[PDB]
């Protein structure tokens, strides 16, 4: 799998900083490129982490899996600490499209089995049902990865 951590065994001290208004779920892609969840971060809190050089991390809203960014990008990769200097992973919200943002709010209020009782244009029912998914994201980042490598 193109997207996966490397078993470097080279320790890297990282500090997750949840600079977002969401409960953050840090996801670690193991050696087989499989998503593994870790302890969530409450809004505006930070936490020290013992990771390793070459490991991959991504972050999502713990309860909805809405996509989030780390240091402005999709993936975070620990590097060797330079002079005991910890590596920062600043988690923030991305600028969602107005539509995606509205979809989030609606999903957070209406139970899936009720989406279709809403008085909105048909097409939007499917958009609501198609909630963010980490697996699909990986597949997407994978193909985006392949394009950026011609």
């Amino acid at each position: 799998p193109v997207l996966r951590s490397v078993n470097s065994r080279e320790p890297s001290q990282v500090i997750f900083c949840n600079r977002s208004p969401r409960v953050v779920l840090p996801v670690w892609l193991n050696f087989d490129g499989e998503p593994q969840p870790y302890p969530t971060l409450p809004p505006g809190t930070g936490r020290r982490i013992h990771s390793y050089r070459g490991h991959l991390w991504l972050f999502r809203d713990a309860g909805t899996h809405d996509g989030l960014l780390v240091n402005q990008t999709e993936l975070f990769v620990p590097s060797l600490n330079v002079d005991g200097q910890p590596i920062f992973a600043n988690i923030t919200l991305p600028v969602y499209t107005l539509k995606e943002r509205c979809l989030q709010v609606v999903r957070s209020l209406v139970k899936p089995e009720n989406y279709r009782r809403l008085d909105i244009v048909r097409s939007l029912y499917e958009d609501l049902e198609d909630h963010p998914n980490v697996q699909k994201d990986l597949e997407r980042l994978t193909q985006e990865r392949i394009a950026h490598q011609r």
Partner: peptide, 18 residues
């Protein structure tokens, strides 16, 4: 042995921006 990430288990801290 494949070493996976782990949490030192310390006191989380507030980010002053909040």
């Amino acid at each position: 042995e494949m070493l996976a990430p782990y949490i030192p288990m310390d006191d989380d801290f507030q980010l002053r921006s909040f």
